[PDB]
Amino acid sequence: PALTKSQTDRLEVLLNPKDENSGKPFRELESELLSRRKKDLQQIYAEERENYLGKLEREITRFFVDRGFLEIKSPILIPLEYIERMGIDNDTELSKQIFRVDKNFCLRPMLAPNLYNYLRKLDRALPDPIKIFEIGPCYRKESDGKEHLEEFTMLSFIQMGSGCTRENLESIITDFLNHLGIDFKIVGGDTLDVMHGDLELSSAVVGPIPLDREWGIDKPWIGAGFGLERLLKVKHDFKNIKRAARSESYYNGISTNL
């Protein structure tokens, strides 16, 4: 007879985007998909052995290092006061999304506060313009599940000082996404969102903005923040973002429950 909804969910777990009702019962559809997915893992294991998320991070790192941006690795566990100093008050959606740790810390929901601090300190040492980027874990409590992870990975890059125009911002974005092979449109201090269909890949900002002064920043700047799992989702055409996440249930978008 027809597939149950539960059986269809199970097959959808094992289904990869360009695999492709029939006289075929569940048992045989499942056995066929199990066989294909095991072979996919075997092929990764025999050849490249790289995780997509780690690999994307290395590729993005190369891109920005080669374009003059300094690679930052800053804390993931940050002072809780950075959150209010970011102007995230009980008025904003974000205030409710913070994972708190102990009395005085939290998991960073974005890279911005640490990068603000790096911008100010590095301005004492480095010639104009100051170009930096970080890639790493960020955390947000989320109700939604298809485009949101509670544990995700952000790329943020910033240029500060000379050349901080909207055109140069859009140009970096454009070179970046064409380099990765990802289709996009830019939709618009100035605040621009980089969209893939209805999926937000990035929020980008042309500074200065009034918030800067809280962080001791008094120069023009441009920057953007990207979700790596969203980039992976689009690039590999995963229909659920959980296939692109740090996970025990998926490896390079392949189910590990085989």
Ligand X SMILES: N[C@@H](Cc1cccc(I)c1)C(=O)O
Residues that bind its own copies (CB under 8 A): 37-38, 41-42, 44-45, 48-51, 53-55, 58, 61, 65, 68-77, 99, 101-102, 107, 114, 117-118, 121-122, 124-127, 137, 139, 150-151, 245-248, 251, 256-258
**For ligand X, what does the binding mask look like between residues 207 and 226, x meaning CB under 6 A?**
----------------xxx-
C-alpha 29/C-alpha 12 separation (Å) is: 11
Site for ligand ATP (CB under 6 A): which residue of 165, 200, 215, 247?
200
Q: What is the DSSP letter of 97?
A: G
Q: Using the minimum distance from each CB to ligand ATP, give the nearer residue, 47 or 198.
A: 198
- Binding of Mg ion by 199 (CB under 5 A): no
Q: Nearest distance from residue 244's CB to ligand X, in Å? A: 18
CB of 70 to ligand ATP, least distance (A): 20
Across 40-76, b (16+ Cβ under 10 Å) vs e yields: beeebeeeeeeebbeebbeebbebbeeeebeebeeee
For ligand ATP, which is the closer residue by CB, 131 or 233?
233
At 239 the three-state DSSP class reads coil
Is residue 148 a contact point for ligand ATP (CB under 6 A)? yes
The count of other CB atoms within 10 Å of the CB of residue 10 is: 18
**Which partner in Mg ion, its own copies, ligand ATP, none is near 230 (CB below 5 to 8 A by kind)?**
ligand ATP
Residue 158 binds which entry of ligand ATP, Mg ion, ligand X, none, with Cβ cut-offs from 5 to 8 Å by kind?
ligand X
Q: Which residue is nearest to ligand X (CB)?
A: 225
Residues in the chain: 258
Candidate list 60, 88, 155, 205; residue touching ligand X; CB under 6 A: 205
- End-to-end, the C-alpha distance of the chain in Å comes to 24
Residue 29 to residue 89: CA distance in whole angstroms: 51
Rounded least distance, CB 24 to ligand ATP, Å? 36
| Contact of residue 121 among Mg ion, its own copies, ligand ATP, none (CB under 5-8 Å per partner type) | its own copies
Buried b (16+ CB within 10 A) or exposed e, 97-123: bbeeeeeebbbbbbbbbbbbbbbbebb
Rounded CA gap, 232 and 213, in Å?
Answer: 35
**Interaction between residue 217 and ligand ATP (CB under 6 A):** no
60 binds ligand X (CB under 6 A): no
Count of H-run helices and E-run strands, the chain: 7, 12
Smaller CB distance to Mg ion: residue 202 or 252? 202
Picking from 139, 141, 143, 121, the residue whose alpha carbon sits closest to that of residue 130 is 121
Q: Any contact of residue 158 with ligand X (CB under 6 A)? A: yes
